[PDB]
Amino acid sequence: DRPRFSFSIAAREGKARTGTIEMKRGVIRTPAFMPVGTAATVKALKPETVRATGADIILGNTYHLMLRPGAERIAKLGGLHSFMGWDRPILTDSGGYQVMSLSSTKQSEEGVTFKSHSRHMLSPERSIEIQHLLGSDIVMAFDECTPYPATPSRAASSMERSMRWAKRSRDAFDSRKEQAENAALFGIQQGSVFENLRQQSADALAEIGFDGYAVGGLAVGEGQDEMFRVLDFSVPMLPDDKPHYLMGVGKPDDIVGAVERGIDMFDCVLPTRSGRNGQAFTWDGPINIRNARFSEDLKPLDSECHCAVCQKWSRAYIHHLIRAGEILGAMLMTEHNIAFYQQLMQKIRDSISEGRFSQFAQDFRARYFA
Amino acid sequence: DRPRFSFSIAAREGKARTGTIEMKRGVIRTPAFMPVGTAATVKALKPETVRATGADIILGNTYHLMLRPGAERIAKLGGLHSFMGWDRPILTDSGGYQVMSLSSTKQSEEGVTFKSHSRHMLSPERSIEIQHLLGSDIVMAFDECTPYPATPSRAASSMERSMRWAKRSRDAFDSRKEQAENAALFGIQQGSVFENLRQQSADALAEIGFDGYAVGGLAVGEGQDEMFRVLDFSVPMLPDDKPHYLMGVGKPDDIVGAVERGIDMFDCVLPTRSGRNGQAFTWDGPINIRNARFSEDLKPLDSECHCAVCQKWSRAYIHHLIRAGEILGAMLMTEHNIAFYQQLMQKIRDSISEGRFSQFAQDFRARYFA
Ligand SMILES: Nc1nc2cc3nc(NCCc4ccc(C(=O)O)cc4)[nH]c3cc2c(=O)[nH]1
Ligand SMILES: Nc1nc2cc3nc(NCCc4ccc(C(=O)O)cc4)[nH]c3cc2c(=O)[nH]1
Ligand SMILES: [Zn+2]
Ligand SMILES: [Zn+2]
Numbered sequence A, B: 001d002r003p004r005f006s007f008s009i010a011a012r013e014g015k016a017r018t019g020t021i022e023m024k025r026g027v028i029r030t031p032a033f034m035p036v037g038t039a040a041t042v043k044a045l046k047p048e049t050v051r052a053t054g055a056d057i058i059l060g061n062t063y064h065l066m067l068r069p070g071a072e073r074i075a076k077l078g079g080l081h082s083f084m085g086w087d088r089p090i091l092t093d094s095g096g097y098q099v100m101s102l103s104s105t106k107q108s109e110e111g112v113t114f115k116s117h118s119r120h121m122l123s124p125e126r127s128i129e130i131q132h133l134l135g136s137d138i139v140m141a142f143d144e145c146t147p148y149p150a151t152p153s154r155a156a157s158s159m160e161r162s163m164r165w166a167k168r169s170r171d172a173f174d175s176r177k178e179q180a181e182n183a184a185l186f187g188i189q190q191g192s193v194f195e196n197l198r199q200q201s202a203d204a205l206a207e208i209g210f211d212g213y214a215v216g217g218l219a220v221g222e223g224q225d226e227m228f229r230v231l232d233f234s235v236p237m238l239p240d241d242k243p244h245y246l247m248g249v250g251k252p253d254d255i256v257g258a259v260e261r262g263i264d265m266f267d268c269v270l271p272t273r274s275g276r277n278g279q280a281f282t283w284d285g286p287i288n289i290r291n292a293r294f295s296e297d298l299k300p301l302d303s304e305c306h307c308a309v310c311q312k313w314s315r316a317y318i319h320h321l322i323r324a325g326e327i328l329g330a331m332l333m334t335e336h337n338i339a340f341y342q343q344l345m346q347k348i349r350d351s352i353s354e355g356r357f358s359q360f361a362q363d364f365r366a367r368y369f370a
Helices: A047-052 A062-067 A071-076 A080-084 A098-102 A124-134 A152-175 A177-182 A195-208 A224-237 A252-260 A270-276 A308-312 A315-324 A327-353 A357-368 B047-052 B062-067 B071-076 B080-084 B098-102 B124-134 B152-175 B177-182 B195-208 B224-237 B252-260 B270-276 B308-312 B315-324 B327-353 B357-368
Strands: A006-013 A016-023 A026-030 A032-034 A058-061 A090-093 A112-115 A119-122 A138-140 A184-189 A212-215 A244-246 A265-267 B006-013 B016-023 B026-030 B032-034 B058-061 B090-093 B112-115 B119-122 B138-140 B184-189 B212-215 B244-246 B265-267
Touching (some): A006 A327, A026 A032, A026 A327, A032 A327, A062 A090, A062 A119, A062 A124, A071 A124, A080 B315, A098 A112, A124 A138, A124 A177, A152 A177, A152 A184, A195 A212, A252 A327, A308 A327, A315 A327, A315 B080, A327 B327, B006 B327, B016 B327, B026 B032, B026 B327, B062 B071, B062 B098, B062 B124, B071 B124, B090 B124, B119 B124, B124 B138, B124 B177, B152 B177, B152 B184, B152 B195, B195 B224, B212 B224, B224 B252, B252 B327, B252 B357, B270 B327, B315 B327
Parallel strands (some): A058 A090, A090 A138, A212 A244, A244 A265, B032 B265, B138 B184, B184 B212, B212 B244
Antiparallel strands (some): A006 A016, A016 A026, B016 B026, B112 B119
16 A cells, blocks of 8 residues: 655656655656646546546645635535545645735734635644645645745745744644645745745755645746746755655746756646637647637647547637637647646656656757747 | 438337437437537537437537538538537538527528628528538428417418428439438428418428428427427328427427427437536436535435436535536536436337336326426
8 A cells, every 4th residue: 555655766867856756545756747626626627537638646725625615515525535536646735825816815923814706714724724624635834925026035034934834834734643644745945036045945844844845936927037047046955855846837848947957746727727718738839729820720739649639629620619619629628738738747757767858858949949 | 331311110109209210420219319519519528428428419500500610611621520529410400590599680582691690691502501511411401480479371471481491402402412312301390389380381391202300480489388289280290200300399398298299309408508507407307506405415416317427426516616617517517417318318218119108208207396
């Protein structure tokens, strides 16, 4: 039987790693992409379809689920896995970001109170409890995603609060025996774009000790160059022997560059959301299927893609569906985009395993941005 | 290899029949329910899912497809079957009803001109041509669905025009060799609620000769009692040895009573449309899954239903999805409702085959309306 949590690195190339996380509900191949299932569904896909694309783990959200349908309700119904029909690992974000992104808020050292987009409360203790009620496999510490840009003073104050909250998150998780024995807890590094603060944050998190370490506070408007600059110094600060999770990233090229910088795990709404909007990922870059140029194009969305959508339907058909606002258009675009992302991750894993990831990254970029 | 068209009746009970229509693209078990795929998709379902529910044939619409994406376009792309990925029979309505239902129209003996809901034209010749371009397997004559209520004079004038159009439809279909050799043509009986006009219409259609005969002009607001009264005298007027198709019907009890009156084929948007709206069919009658009473109900939509949705997900989950406006809610409700309809048809076919359809109809009604 699989352990609660075990991360093993099978191969490395520079800062890049490939390996596996073993958990009770399944194995996660890294680097991993997690489709986002904010409201207990990966939008427009059955869980079996999510699995068919290659996903090993999906992401849920404490914030959304606590509002609808409710955390206690989901627990009464048997937990998130049973509720939505996904029996593999689920990582849940802690609310630390979504509350400030979506609500309409009172922040204090205790936590955050907010109006539902009714009054609600989050705190390290309540966040960890909600994630327990959901039956999350990977529980995220309750943090504060510092707005960007931030002054060094404000970034420091914010990060310091997040580190106090990280310790509270650790203690809350550990005090709940069933959770501590069956789930994993990841800490979240903050510090904005400042090396010294990132270092202090990493040191604080490592002192507390977590099963994995997220790089928080990025993909908040800073752009790729700056994100990569921050990753350059930030990822090496994290314990080498635990997974490194870059929250909310990203476009295919973001993922490739982040893996080059030591990231093992990703989540992003981009493939799902933009799929519904008509954007399809291809190895020659994204296309917008709504464009008139696709109205009579019999080719699949991507010429190499192995997904069921590309095996069966044309660009022309999907163009029609999306133009018409048909649900099947959302379904097909989403399945393809998530499959594309998983194929990207597979190519990344294989190339690192084979010691040719640098060449893959170069080839990928040359073609994607041709 | 299957013939262009062959209808065989395997068993009868009173006016009810069960049998098969063999066509080049597949066998259709009768009585049959055709899911509606107006815009080249059965809304929220992949064609494989439509097939998995038990459907042998689906319905498309000349009116919608001629507007978007265009009939000539679909022909250029290889026909409707290839375009949407359904390789089994497709019946297409002729436009005769939808143009007057949805457009904003100039009617004449030649046909109908109308504004797209751009100016367009339909006529017996153009309708048959569009259905050819789509590659329809069962082509419907271009008719006029008389509004309800109608005076006897207006119903007669309307029906007479439809019969002239039925002959034009026949001649247009026959003049197109590939269509005549590979597709079937059904005539549509009109005459409103008037026995003498229904008889005249049946006589006219039988004189022209068709592969099948639809009862048109019903499910236009007359209600079940009146519909059944009209069916009582109208269906026996049609040739016994050809399929009888009741257009646009209907609720489960409508279908049962119509089969009792000799109908072999049905189509209706009810299971798809109302599914997306939160109505689920069950053997104990319809439920609205949005209702708060389902928020923590772990039972499947229906206790006996064999569909994949009822095997896996709870009412509580689907309640959440529909409340949240999630696409997966539409998907699951629709798959279940279409599966329910197909199971109804299967029970009807089996009971007629076994000479216990009268008992089935009684048992069905007693429970459905308890
Ligand atoms: N707990 C926690 N969670 C986070 C989630 C994040 N998500 C992001 N970026 C997402 C950006 C984003 C937004 C929209 C789309 C799209 O619609 O395509 C894609 C990416 N940065 C994030 C930072 C944090 C963080 O520090 N702490
Ligand atoms: N060519 C032709 N086509 C028809 C289609 C029809 N469809 C109906 N009834 C549909 C009624 C209908 C409308 C909406 C819903 C729902 O949303 O649930 C269900 C049923 N009656 C109809 C009559 C004709 C006809 O004479 N000629
Ligand atoms: Zn694909
Ligand atoms: Zn069902």
